[PDB]
Ligand binder design. Structure first.
Ligand SMILES: NC(=O)[C@H]1CCC(=O)N(Cc2csc3ccccc23)C1
Ligand SMILES: [Zn+2]
Length: 139
């Protein structure tokens, strides 16, 4: 689990969105596994605006943060799960690192701020849904 809180927005994995997230929907994209809902409280996270390929992510299944090198956002084939059939997920970045399904939502950060959230994984890889291109999260 995990979310990004910026301004009057809450960014979560679309497959983990709650009833309140859907009742206050701002934007969702199944191909990216992202959903953004509105909040009454003001969020303080900073979103990165950059093309970094190194950062640190939080891994809840180890209670640890790990430093990683990751690929630029791209269209990657993702195996079926209980939430989606096998499909291409867009805006996805991969790294070599540990992840389990419950790790989804953990933040990946660089020196500029929040880069994205854990969304995919398996076989010693971890994939992150990018949020750096969502310029509207700031205004
Ligand atoms: N299509 C998606 O974005 C998600 C939907 C929900 C889901 O359980 N997964 C699989 C998954 C995510 S982290 C991880 C780590 C080790 C094994 C499996 C997984 C994919
Ligand atoms: Zn950066």
């Amino acid at each position: 689990s995990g979310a990004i809180y910026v301004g009057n927005y809450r960014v979560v994995n679309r497959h983990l969105a709650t009833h309140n997230d859907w009742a206050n929907l701002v934007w969702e994209d199944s191909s990216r596994d992202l959903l953004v809902s509105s909040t009454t409280a003001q969020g303080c996270d900073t979103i990165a605006r950059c093309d970094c390929q190194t950062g640190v992510y939080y891994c809840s299944s180890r209670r640890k943060h790990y430093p990683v090198s990751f690929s630029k956002p791209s269209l990657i084939f993702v195996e079926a799960s209980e939430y989606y059939p096998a499909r291409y997920q867009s805006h996805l970045m991969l790294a070599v690192g540990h992840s389990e399904p419950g790790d989804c939502g953990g933040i990946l950060r660089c020196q500029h701020g929040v880069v994205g959230i854990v969304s995919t994984g398996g076989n010693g890889l971890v994939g992150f849904a990018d949020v750096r291109d969502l310029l509207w999260l700031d205004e």
